[PDB]
């Protein structure tokens, strides 16, 4: 509808063994750090992961409807059925209806997961445009970070050379230095083919010459 | 007595606690046509008899294409059946729009059931008096269900509706083991034989009444109609 | 007249159906009694079970309607439980709207009106229950009000419930000449005594269930065994 | 106008300034913003006249219904909440500043309501166009342990300050003392400046005015 | 407040034979100066030798497409019989005439083959309306490309000396040539070019890539 | 100009001892173009009770008819007379409903109760608040001036003959104030034995 | 909001300790130099274990508070024993969300149960429901941020916390705002709820200002 | 004519209506289910009669779930039980999200109790003819077992059983321990009780079905099939043959 | 259902041309404890008997006279629950209508409203009419007062009337004794005598309830006040 307490910069990629996602942990109210160390991580099922950016209030609202989906039916309601391609579509419809009322939401979300053999990484926006691409970034990250990530992820053999975390780690440091509407801490989560893993509280690493050239504090 | 009493209450309960309405409904299923259902569980076939009221007519269909992976045979009156069929097609359409998934036929069947059951549980609704053999080719294979107007939902590996259902059942149990998880051809022969058991058996086999409908691993909904069954005879 | 699918005015002066609610209102053998003092108001009930495959720590027939108000119900179980739920909502609402505490009497009168309409419908029957309201007011002191499902309610000096009410009434009148001469506990003792005579059972620690309302507290509490046994012992000493 | 309330230990005095103004011209020299909502719950109301009256009548109605059903003395706190609830639903249009006061067996209580939907309790309160002027006098003048005579002298002063400083307030001052053992309505406590002057005009018969049409209509039925 | 209008459209070209048709489109989709995606066509195969394309906004484009597909399925259930091109042509318009209140829109085109053994292409305005075509370019770059396209493919203007009749092969050469040229005159054309070639045998797809800078 | 001003108009009532008086203008034009110098804006309901209304003319016609409906039915049910007070209330309730809408009217009530033998006047506001009048009553757009004159001209005791002069001159002063040229006026002089109606002679253009 | 707007400093916090939570807040609301409301409470019992700090516009907050009380009252009689955590938080959220942008409430809900211990939740204007170690609220936070950063105290005593809130709030009102008067506090423990009141003349010349809570 | 089969919104000379007694006869007319509660959790077991080989189970059983922490079993008519149940889970779910808590067993019961009593006051909607057995393990409260009757009566239990066998089963159950060892041990014990019960019901085969909510299950609702079901069966087969 | 049931009424035209249910209600009325009314012209007296039947009671708890308004009061014979309910709806209607206006209530209008509610129930089915008869007692100015309202839906004026058990016999006593000018104290003496004659189970200062409409409308008598009259003439 209109921003209140908001989150920015959710980065993601696909890799051989999985998809990798990273996001800072911040709830800013314009520029006042209301919450430091706040999650953005919704595990969906156990085999799919949603990273969400945008309004934080709206996020909470969406988490619950998702929650109802698996506590219903004879077997679990996100068990035998409901694949990530389905979960992506279901989400897109929900934005679409709001926009049609013109009483809108205000988030951009990445649904990431594994299907059963294939990586799933799909985008949804406040606009409501839906795509799958191997690389996604939100916010500030959408403008700045995504060409750095793109060099690696538009060259398909070079993807195959490594597990991605390092590109992610590196980008996020450049991002923290240039922008101070961002916070030093981040969380990074990896969805592998059978498993899901979250690495908790990290802080950006201090570069060599780059640390002299540019700092992250105001 | 009190036959009229038991019609007048759709909320009926008797000393023996029976509900006559269901009873009436069962007699109406037996009044219908002859249909068998069979599955190997990698192919499923149904021989269905389509009959005609008189000489100068031509047979009315009782095999309905509900979907391009699911289907039915009807056994009981044509008029009610049409009404149910629209609801189920639209339920398939939103599954496709919203979810883009076929959806388990098992899950579907169960949902339809409730919505009927609840109006028997209150004033109004007469029985619908059509029984169905519902087939479909889903994710875990084909599956077969019997829907009754008693909303009695059962999955069976083969079943039958029509007067002298039991006859054909006993043959299905006997041949049951022979069905295995192969051969198209064999399932149909047994069906043609079986179907003979359902009829009074004074009526000789005919190619204009019979109709053969298959769905299977790479198959969807196909009907063999009239003469077209002769190739596979 | 025609009770068959409608209820009408009759020369009977009552209704066969209203009498039938009065008649069978218990299908077990519990009996209850309630007495009023200026020191307490006590309701004495029973605890009984048919087997021990059943729990007894959730089985109760005494309800805490709210902090101040207490309610013991004589009625069909289904009907008793429904009415409580309806009441709980109505009270709460009365608190919200007025901002002040709901009088005991006020609830009995409100509930009574809900009973009465159902008596006008020939498309719905009244719930089958007698509700005894007990409480401690600061506006007249403690108050004891019984309802019956005719739409009748009145406040009494003490009352009794179960199927042997009239028998309990006879003891009560004898007693009721002098009752302001009983102190706290001695109220309780007499209260035990009149149920034991009717029912003809010298009680046991797990057969009895005394509930007391206490003046100068907004407590309704069901008593602990030590206190309940202390009384029981007290009548032995006078035997 | 200015409406004020001062509480003392054996009762409450409410006072108000009487005067209705339209333009720069006086619509009502004498009027009454002392309202009966109950025999012991009074409110004075200020603001839009039309909003004030409508609420007084509704609320009086609701309260009166309660009063018979229960058979006991009502509460002001209930009167305050039925008013407070109303404002929240309309979500503004209403422009009435009311001082709801009352005496009970529960104590004397004193509240105000602001058309925004905000109410408070204070030992003294005032509202008025005059409010800011009265309030300066009040703070200084207030001392605890007030009684009837002390309150009365203070309240009379209080209104008198609003008349002098505020140009849109003038004319007589009305006081009303509400005790939990009697009610006193004090009709013109002070009488200041008068409506106008005689600037001359003399009289002569209807004949000196040239008339177009004359007509009669005898009226025999009274 | 938030927008009730966002652009996203590409550029497409529909060419009508007399027993074939091709509908060709860039994969590049952009809005302004930021690039939405470097891939995806707005031309789709509806099936049964009907090819459709909806230029205007991606959000609207998917939704119409899905929805039409059910009306066709339902219809066949209702008694065996299918929509012809013309039928479909009316069906889209009613939807649009409804949407005249809705503030997002699209510029739709349908193409396919008749049973007269020739192409029909019908083109719609974003309020409703239909017209009979011979050739249509749609999207952004269309306005510039079209007079030239009309002349080279057509020879039906009052400014050419001769006619020649279409050939498939010849149509394919012209189409690639127009697109390769379009690219250094727009930032709404580029990357790759997806060709849907429509014949009476069935529907074939060809892809060729283009320049970018 | 306003939602009440397109045809202007003013109305006065003054009280006498043992009598009361109501005077009004007449004129109807369309905007500023005077077509006719007639249009009653005062009606009576029973001999002695007079009601003067001052909105827009359109509104006035509708409101006068509403009051007729209500009053007649009310009168019928109670089966005894209506009082002046009762009319005043009724007007308020009606005044309250119109407050959301663009029908804004100022009424004035005047009459002398002759089953009680006291004079009665009131004015009412267009937001619906009733304010009980005394000795003089004003209505119209000219009100600020009119008020000025009424505070000056009045004297505590009045005889119908003196009362007649007072209103006449009031009316004379009042017609000069109009920019809408509201020429023509009526007077009704009420006694609990007689009513006089007078149309008055005044400027003509 | 309906017809107010606050343009003055607010200063509220709840700080957690072992025994429970201690709440503090300023008194009086003001719009400008003219005093919108004199020394008043917003430390509200809506339960005996459950208290709140109200902030923003008076009318909105008052309405929200009674509404929750009604629901919890019905809930308490039948489920029995209310814990603060999921259960208070959601009921306040739904309203903030539904009534959306015609609603101005900044609430610190603090409660103590022996069920999971004491909790602190903070309603921002978006209505996010956040479990906090401890929280500071108001506009006056901006003044206190620096103090808390400097001092770096840890370890709680009922006495130690009382000084901590006292210097922070005192300063905040001093530089800007026109809010002041009394600072009121509740220490909530298994003992029951203890009410402290401190006069506006007894509340300066304090120090200490924890940031690590352990 | 009795004049009150016709109604279901009125009183009778027997008080409640004949229709309501009848619903109570019909549950007893059904098959047989038991439940045993312990201090570590609660076990459910039910007997299902086999019809013929054509058939197979795949959505029609007699053990049903509530939510994803609640276990549900019933006696009476299958189709109607399923209808009650789908709504209960949904009602529970709106709560679960709204108050943020994972519903009690006790609150769920109250909600169902109220529905059934309302249907007794009217003649619009004929009642259900089921009896429902529910319960689980609550992380901080324990195990609690309830049973709701079509008679508008519900209670908390140590054991409950229903079916034709009812009287007899409760006798055996009554004979055993309050604690009853550990849950695992109970899986074997319940199987003997069913095993022996079937000699009394025997006209055709049966299939033994067992379920659990265990400390090891961590309070979730699961079926006990697998080798685990078979061992308990072997132990009954050894002990007696009946 | 929730809108199904009996649309037409239980009461039905007969080839008698009588209304069965209506006939029964005269019986329903009949069962009532003894009631009387005396109009003292300047005053009004209404009186009835509280029967008593359980020694177990409190205070003087529920009444059988309740004030609708501060000027009109009702007393009745017929069924008690019906009475409580009847009073609530009317009581609501009396305040709402006469606070729109500031005029005080006219008597006839209350009667018109009570009769309509009684009559709508005759018109419609599902619900049965009330089986009470009321005495509407008030005072206002110099107007006539004392009115009777039937379960039939009909109204009549009276100077004196009686209800309850043996209504015809009491009325015949009443008819003879009640004449010309009397006093408010005097009217009370008579009413007790007329009630005693109908039946006395006993009379105490708690078997009697007397209320009057005189100075400023309805006023409730103290228990002592009535007792003074019992001694004044037993």
UniProtKB/Swiss-Prot annotation, chain B:
Principal place of residence: cytoplasm
InterPro entries: Ntn_hydrolases_N, Proteasome_alpha, Proteasome_alpha-type, Proteasome_alpha1, Proteasome_asu_N, Proteasome_sua/b
Gene3D superfamilies in the cross-refs: Glutamine Phosphoribosylpyrophosphate, subunit 1, domain 1
GO cellular component: centrosome; cytoplasm; cytosol; extracellular exosome; nucleoplasm; nucleus; proteasome complex; proteasome core complex
Disulfide cross-links: none
Annotated function: Component of the 20S core proteasome complex involved in the proteolytic degradation of most intracellular proteins. This complex plays numerous essential roles within the cell by associating with different regulatory particles. Associated with two 19S regulatory particles, forms the 26S proteasome and thus participates in the ATP-dependent degradation of ubiquitinated proteins.
Name of the protein: Proteasome subunit alpha type-1
Species this chain originates from: Homo sapiens (Human)
Lineage: Eukaryota, Metazoa, Chordata, Craniata, Vertebrata
From Swiss-Prot, chain E:
Function: Non-catalytic component of the 20S core proteasome complex involved in the proteolytic degradation of most intracellular proteins. This complex plays numerous essential roles within the cell by associating with different regulatory particles. Associated with two 19S regulatory particles, forms the 26S proteasome and thus participates in the ATP-dependent degradation of ubiquitinated proteins.
Record-listed N6-acetyllysine modification sites: 176
Family stated for the protein in its record: Belongs to the peptidase T1B family.
Record gene name: PSMB1
Protein known as: Proteasome subunit beta type-1
Domain of life: Eukaryota
Entry-linked CDD domains: proteasome_beta_type_1
Residues modified as Phosphoserine: 34, 40, 134
Localization per record: Cytoplasm; Nucleus
Keyword annotations from UniProtKB, A to Z: Acetylation, Cytoplasm, Deafness, Glycoprotein, Host-virus interaction, Intellectual disability, Nucleus, Phosphoprotein, Proteasome
Disease: Neurodevelopmental disorder with microcephaly, hypotonia, and absent language: An autosomal recessive disorder characterized by microcephaly, intellectual disability with absent speech, severe developmental delay, short stature, and hypotonia. Affected individuals also manifest aggressive behavior and have hearing loss.
Modified residues (Phosphotyrosine): 122
One Pfam family named in its UniProt record: Proteasome
Predominant cellular place of this UniProt entry's protein: cytoplasm
GO cellular component: cytoplasm; cytosol; extracellular exosome; extracellular region; ficolin-1-rich granule lumen; nucleoplasm; nucleus; proteasome complex
Residues carrying a glycan: 30, 181
UniProtKB/Swiss-Prot annotation, chain G:
Subcellular location: Cytoplasm; Nucleus
Enzyme Commission designation: 3.4.25.1
Induction: Down-regulated by IFNG/IFN-gamma (at protein level). Up-regulated in anaplastic thyroid cancer cell lines.
Keyword match Phosphoprotein: yes
Coiled-coil stretches noted in the UniProt entry, renumbered to this chain: none
GO MF term (any one): cadherin binding
Keyword annotations of the record: Acetylation, Cytoplasm, Host-virus interaction, Hydrolase, Nucleus, Phosphoprotein, Protease, Proteasome, Threonine protease, Zymogen
Keyword Nucleus included in the entry's annotation: yes
Reaction it catalyzes: Cleavage of peptide bonds with very broad specificity
EC top class named in words: hydrolase
List of catalytic residues: 10
Single GO cellular component term: proteasome core complex
PANTHER family assigned to the protein according to its UniProt record, in alphabetical order: METALLOPROTEASE TLDD (PTHR32194), PROTEASOME SUBUNIT BETA (PTHR32194:SF14)
Function: Component of the 20S core proteasome complex involved in the proteolytic degradation of most intracellular proteins. This complex plays numerous essential roles within the cell by associating with different regulatory particles. Associated with two 19S regulatory particles, forms the 26S proteasome and thus participates in the ATP-dependent degradation of ubiquitinated proteins.
Assembly: The 26S proteasome consists of a 20S proteasome core and two 19S regulatory subunits. The 20S proteasome core is a barrel-shaped complex made of 28 subunits that are arranged in four stacked rings. The two outer rings are each formed by seven alpha subunits, and the two inner rings are formed by seven beta subunits. The proteolytic activity is exerted by three beta-subunits PSMB5, PSMB6 and PSMB7.
Annotated source species: Homo sapiens
Gene that this sequence comes from: PSMB6
Swiss-Prot record, chain H:
GO cellular component terms, A-Z: cytoplasm; cytosol; extracellular exosome; nucleoplasm; nucleus; proteasome complex; proteasome core complex; proteasome core complex, alpha-subunit complex
Modified residues (N6-acetyllysine): 53, 202, 226
Xref: Pfam families: Proteasome, Proteasome_A_N
PTM annotation (Phosphoserine): residues: 239
Keyword Zinc listed: no
Compartments where located: Cytoplasm; Nucleus
Domain of life: Eukaryota
Entry keyword annotation includes Cytoplasm: yes
Any one Gene Ontology molecular-function term assigned to this protein's record: ubiquitin protein ligase binding
Example GO biological process: proteasome-mediated ubiquitin-dependent protein catabolic process
Assigned keywords, A-Z: Acetylation, Cytoplasm, Host-virus interaction, Nucleus, Phosphoprotein, Proteasome
Induction: Down-regulated by antioxidants BO-653 and probucol. Up-regulated by bacterial lipopolysaccharides (LPS) and TNF.
PROSITE patterns: PROTEASOME_ALPHA_1 (PS00388), PROTEASOME_ALPHA_2 (PS51475)
UniProt subunit comment: The 26S proteasome consists of a 20S proteasome core and two 19S regulatory subunits. The 20S proteasome core is a barrel-shaped complex made of 28 subunits that are arranged in four stacked rings. The two outer rings are each formed by seven alpha subunits, and the two inner rings are formed by seven beta subunits. The proteolytic activity is exerted by three beta-subunits PSMB5, PSMB6 and PSMB7. Interacts with AURKB. Interacts with CDKN1A. Interacts with MDM2 and RB1. Interacts with the C-terminus of TBXA2R isoform 2. Interacts with DNAJB2. (Microbial infection) Interacts with HIV-1 Tat protein.
Family designation: Belongs to the peptidase T1A family.
Identification of the protein by name: Proteasome subunit alpha type-3
């Amino acid at each position: 509808q209109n921003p209140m307490v908001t989150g920015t910069s959710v980065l993601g990629v696909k890799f051989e063994g999985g998809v990798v996602i990273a996001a800072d942990m911040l709830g800013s109210y314009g520029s006042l750090a209301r919450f430091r160390n706040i999650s953005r991580i919704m595990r969906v099922n156990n085999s799919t992961m949603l990273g969400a950016s945008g309004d934080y209030a709206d996020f909470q609202y969406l988490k619950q409807v998702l929650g109802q989906m698996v506590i219903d039916e004879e077997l679990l309601g996100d068990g035998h059925s409901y694949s990530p391609r389905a979960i992506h579509s279901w989400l897109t419809r929900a934005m679409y209806s709001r926009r049609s009322k013109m009483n809108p939401l205000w988030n951009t979300m990445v649904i990431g997961g594994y299907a059963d053999g294939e990586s799933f990484l799909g985008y949804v926006d406040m606009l409501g445009v839906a795509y799958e691409a191997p690389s996604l970034a939100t916010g500030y990250g959408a403008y700045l970070a995504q060409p750095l990530l793109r060099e690696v992820l538009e060259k398909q053999p070079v993807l195959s050379q490594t597990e991605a975390r390092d590109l992610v780690e590196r980008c996020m440091r450049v991002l923290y230095y240039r922008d101070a509407r961002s916070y030093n801490r981040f969380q990074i989560a990896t969805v592998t083919e059978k498993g899901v893993e979250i690495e908790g509280p990290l802080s950006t690493e201090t570069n060599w010459d780059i640390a002299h050239m540019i700092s992250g504090f105001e | 007595m009190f036959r009229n009493q038991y019609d007048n209450d759709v909320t009926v309960w008797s000393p023996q606690g029976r509900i006559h309405q269901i009873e009436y409904a069962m007699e109406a299923v037996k009044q219908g046509s002859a249909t068998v259902g069979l599955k190997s569980k990698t192919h499923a076939v149904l021989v269905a008899l389509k009959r005609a009221q008189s000489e100068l007519a031509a047979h009315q269909k009782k095999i309905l294409h509900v979907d391009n992976h699911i289907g039915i045979s009807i056994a009981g009156l044509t008029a009610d059946a049409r009404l149910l069929c629209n609801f189920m097609r639209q339920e398939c359409l939103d599954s496709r729009f919203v979810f883009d998934r076929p959806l388990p036929v098992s899950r579907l069947v169960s949902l339809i059931g409730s919505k009927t059951q609840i109006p028997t549980q209150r004033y109004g609704r007469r029985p619908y008096g059509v029984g169905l053999l519902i087939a479909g080719y889903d994710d875990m294979g084909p599956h077969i269900f019997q829907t009754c107007p008693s909303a009695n939902y059962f999955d069976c590996r083969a079943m039958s509706i029509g007067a002298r259902s039991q006859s054909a059942r006993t043959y299905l149990e006997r041949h049951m083991s022979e069905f295995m998880e192969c051969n198209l051809n064999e399932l149909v022969k047994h069906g043609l034989r079986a179907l003979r058991e359902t009829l009074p058996a004074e009526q000789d086999l005919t190619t204009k009444n019979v109709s053969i409908g298959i769905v299977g691993k790479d198959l969807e909904f196909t009907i063999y109609d009239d003469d077209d069954v002769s190739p596979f005879l | 007249g025609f009770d068959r699918h409608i209820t009408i005015f009759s020369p009977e002066g009552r209704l066969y159906q209203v009498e039938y609610a009065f008649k069978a209102i218990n299908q077990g053998g519990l009996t209850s009694v309630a007495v009023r003092g200026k020191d307490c108001a006590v309701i004495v009930t029973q605890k009984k079970v048919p087997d021990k495959l059943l729990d007894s720590s959730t089985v109760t027939h005494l309800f805490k309607i709210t902090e101040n108000i207490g309610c013991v119900m004589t009625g069909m179980t289904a009907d008793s439980r429904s009415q409580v739920q309806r009441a709980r909502y109505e009270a709460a609402n009365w608190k919200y709207k007025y901002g002040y505490e709901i009088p005991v009497d006020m609830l009995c009168k409100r509930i009574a009106d809900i009973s009465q309409v159902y008596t006008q419908n020939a498309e719905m029957r009244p719930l089958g229950c007698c509700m005894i309201l007990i409480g401690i007011d600061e506006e007249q002191g403690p108050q004891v009000y019984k309802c019956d499902p005719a739409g009748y309610y009145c406040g009494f000096k003490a009352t009794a419930a179960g199927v042997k009410q009239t028998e309990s009434t006879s003891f009560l009148e004898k007693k009721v000449k002098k009752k302001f001469d009983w102190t706290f506990e001695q109220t309780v003792e007499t209260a035990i005594t009149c149920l034991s005579t009717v029912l003809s059972i010298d009680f046991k620690p797990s057969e009895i269930e005394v509930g007391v309302v206490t003046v100068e507290n907004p407590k309704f509490r069901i008593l602990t065994e030590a206190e309940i046994d202390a009384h029981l012992v007290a009548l032995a000493e006078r035997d | 106008t200015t409406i004020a309330g001062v509480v003392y230990k054996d009762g409450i005095v409410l006072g108000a300034d009487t005067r209705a103004t339209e333009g720069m011209v006086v619509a009502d020299k004498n009027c009454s913003k002392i309202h009966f909502i109950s025999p012991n719950i009074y409110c004075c109301g200020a603001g839009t006249a039309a909003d004030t009256d409508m609420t007084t009548q509704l609320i009086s109605s609701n309260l009166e219904l309660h009063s018979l059903s229960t058979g006991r003395l009502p509460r002001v706190v209930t009167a305050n909440r039925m008013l407070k609830q109303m404002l929240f639903r309309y979500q503004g249009y209403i422009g009435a500043a009311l001082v709801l006061g009352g005496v009970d067996v529960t104590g004397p209580h004193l509240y105000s309501i602001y058309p925004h939907g905000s109410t408070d309790k204070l030992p003294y309160v005032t509202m008025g166009s005059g409010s800011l002027a009265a309030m300066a006098v009040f703070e200084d003048k207030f001392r605890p342990d007030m009684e009837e005579e002390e309150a009365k002298n203070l309240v009379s002063e209080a209104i008198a300050a609003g008349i002098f400083n505020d140009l849109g307030s003038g004319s007589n001052i009305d006081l009303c003392v509400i005790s939990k053992n009697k009610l006193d309505f004090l009709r013109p406590y002070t009488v200041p400046n008068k409506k106008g002057t005689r600037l001359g005009r003399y009289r002569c018969e209807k004949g000196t005015t040239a008339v177009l049409t004359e007509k009669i209509t005898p009226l025999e039925i009274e | 407040r938030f927008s009730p209008y966002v652009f996203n459209g590409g550029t497409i070209l529909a060419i009508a034979g007399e027993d074939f048709a091709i509908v060709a489109s860039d994969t590049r989709l952009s809005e302004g100066f930021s690039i939405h995606t470097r891939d995806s066509p707005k031309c789709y195969k509806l099936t049964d030798k009907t090819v459709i394309g909806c230029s205007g906004f991606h959000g609207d484009c998917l939704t119409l497409t899905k929805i039409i597909e059910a009306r066709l399925k339902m219809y066949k259930h209702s008694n065996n019989k299918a929509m012809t091109t013309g039928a479909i042509a009316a069906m889209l318009s009613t939807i649009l005439y409804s949407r005249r209140f809705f503030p997002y829109y699209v510029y739709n085109i349908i193409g396919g083959l008749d049973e007269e053994g020739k192409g029909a292409v019908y083109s719609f305005d974003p309020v409703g309306s239909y017209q009979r075509d011979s050739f249509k370019a749609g999207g952004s770059a269309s306005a510039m490309l079209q007079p030239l396209l009309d002349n080279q493919v057509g020879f039906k203007n009052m400014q050419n000396v001769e006619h020649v009749p279409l050939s498939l092969d010849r149509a394919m050469r012209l189409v690639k040539d127009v697109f390769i040229s379009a690219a250094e005159r727009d930032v709404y054309t580029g990357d790759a070019l997806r060709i849907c070639i429509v014949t009476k045998e069935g529907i074939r797809e060809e892809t060729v890539s283009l320049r970018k800078d | 100009m306003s939602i009440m001003s397109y045809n202007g108009g003013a109305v006065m009532a003054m009280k006498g001892k043992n009598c009361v008086a109501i005077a009004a203008d007449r004129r109807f034009g369309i905007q500023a173009q005077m077509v006719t110098t007639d249009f009653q804006k005062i009606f009576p309901m029973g001999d002695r009770l007079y009601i003067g209304l001052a909105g827009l003319a359109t509104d006035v016609q509708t409101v006068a008819q509403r009051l007729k409906f209500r009053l007649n039915l009310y009168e019928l049910k109670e089966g005894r007379q209506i009082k002046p007070y009762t009319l005043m209330s009724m007007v308020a309730n009606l005044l309250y409903e119109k407050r959301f809408g663009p029908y804004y009217t100022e009424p004035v009530i005047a009459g002398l109760d002759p089953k009680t033998f006291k004079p009665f006047i009131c004015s009412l506001d267009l937001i619906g608040c009733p304010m009980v009048t005394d000795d003089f009553v004003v209505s119209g757009t000219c009100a600020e001036q009119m008020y000025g004159m009424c505070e000056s001209l009045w004297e505590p005791n009045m005889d119908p003959d003196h009362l007649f002069e007072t209103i006449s001159q009031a009316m004379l002063n009042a017609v000069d104030r109009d920019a809408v040229s509201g020429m023509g006026v009526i007077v009704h002089i009420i006694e609990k034995d007689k009513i006089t109606t007078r149309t008055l002679k005044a400027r003509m253009d | 909001w309906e017809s107010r707007e606050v343009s003055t400093g607010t200063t509220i916090m709840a700080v957690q300790f072992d025994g429970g939570v201690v709440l503090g807040a300023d008194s009086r609301t003001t719009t400008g130099s003219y005093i919108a409301n004199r020394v008043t409470d917003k430390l509200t019992p809506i339960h005996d274990r459950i208290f709140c700090c109200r902030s923003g516009s008076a009318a909105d907050t008052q309405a929200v508070a009674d509404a929750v009380t009604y629901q919890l009252g019905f809930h308490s009689i039948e489920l029995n024993e209310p814990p603060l955590v999921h259960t208070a938080a959601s009921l306040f959220k739904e309203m903030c969300y539904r009534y959306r942008e015609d609603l101005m409430a900044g609430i610190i809900i603090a409660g103590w149960d022996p069920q999971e211990g004491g909790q602190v939740y903070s309603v921002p204007m978006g209505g996010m429901m956040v479990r906090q170690s401890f929280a500071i609220g108001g506009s006056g936070s901006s003044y206190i941020y620096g103090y808390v950063d400097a001092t770096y105290r840890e370890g709680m005593t009922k006495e130690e916390c009382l000084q901590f809130t006292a210097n922070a709030l005192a300063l905040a009102m001093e530089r800007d705002g026109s809010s002041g008067g009394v600072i009121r506090l509740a220490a909530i423990a298994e003992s029951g709820v203890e009410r402290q009141v401190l006069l506006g003349d007894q509340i300066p010349k304090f120090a200490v200002a924890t940031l690590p809570p352990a | 004519g009795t004049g009150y089969d016709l109604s279901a919104s009125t009183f009778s000379p027997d008080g409640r209506v004949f229709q309501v007694e009848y619903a109570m006869k019909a549950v007893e007319n059904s098959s047989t289910a038991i439940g045993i509660r312990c201090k570590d959790g609660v076990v459910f077991g039910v007997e299902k009669l086999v019809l013929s080989k054509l058939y197979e189970e795949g959505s029609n059983k007699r053990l049903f779930n509530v939510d994803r922490h609640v276990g549900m079993a019933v006696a009476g008519l299958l189709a109607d039980a399923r209808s009650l149940a789908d709504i209960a889970r949904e009602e529970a779910s709106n709560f679960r999200s709204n108050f943020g808590y994972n519903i009690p067993l006790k609150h769920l019961a109250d909600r169902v109790a109220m529905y059934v009593h309302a249907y007794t006051l009217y003649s619009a909607v004929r009642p259900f003819g089921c009896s429902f057995m529910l319960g689980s393990y609550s992380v901080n409260d324990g195990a609690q077992l309830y049973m709701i009757d079509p008679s508008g009566v519900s209670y908390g239990y140590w054991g409950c059983a229903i079916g034709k066998a009812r009287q007899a089963a409760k006798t055996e159950i009554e004979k055993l321990q309050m604690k009853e060892m550990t849950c695992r041990d109970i899986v074997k014990e319940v199987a003997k009780i069913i095993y022996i019960v079937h000699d009394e019901v025997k006209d055709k085969a049966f299939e033994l079905e067992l379920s659990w909510v265990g400390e090891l299950t961590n309070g979730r609702h699961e079926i006990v099939p697998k080798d685990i079901r078979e061992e308990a069966e072997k132990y009954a087969k050894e002990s007696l043959k009946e | 259902m929730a809108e199904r049931g009996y649309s037409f009424s239980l009461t039905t035209f007969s080839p008698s041309g009588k209304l069965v249910q209506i006939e029964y209600a005269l019986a329903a009325v009949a069962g009532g404890a003894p009631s009387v009314g005396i109009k003292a012209a300047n005053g009004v007296v209404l009186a009835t008997e509280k029967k008593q039947k359980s020694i177990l009671y409190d205070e003087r708890s529920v009444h059988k006279v309740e004030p609708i308004t501060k000027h009109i009061g009702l007393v009745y014979s017929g069924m008690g629950p019906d009475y409580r309910v009847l009073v609530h709806r009317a009581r609501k209607l009396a305040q709402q209508y006469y606070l729109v206006y500031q005029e005080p209530i006219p008597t006839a209008q209350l009667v018109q409203r009570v009769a309509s509610v009684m009559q709508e129930y005759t018109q419609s089915g599902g619900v049965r009419p009330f089986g009470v008869s009321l005495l509407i007692c008030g005072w206002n100015e110099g107007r006539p007062y004392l009115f009777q309202s039937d379960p039939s839906g009909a109204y009549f004026a009276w100077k004196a009337t009686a209800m309850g058990k043996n209504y015809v016999n009491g009325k015949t006593f009443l008819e003879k004794r009640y004449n010309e000018d009397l006093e408010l104290e005097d009217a009370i003496h008579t009413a007790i005598l007329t009630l005693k004659e109908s039946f006395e189970g006993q009379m105490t200062e708690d078997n009697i309830e007397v209320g009057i409409c005189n100075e400023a409308g309805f006023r409730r008598l103290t228990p002592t006040e009535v007792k003074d009259y019992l001694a004044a003439i037993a």
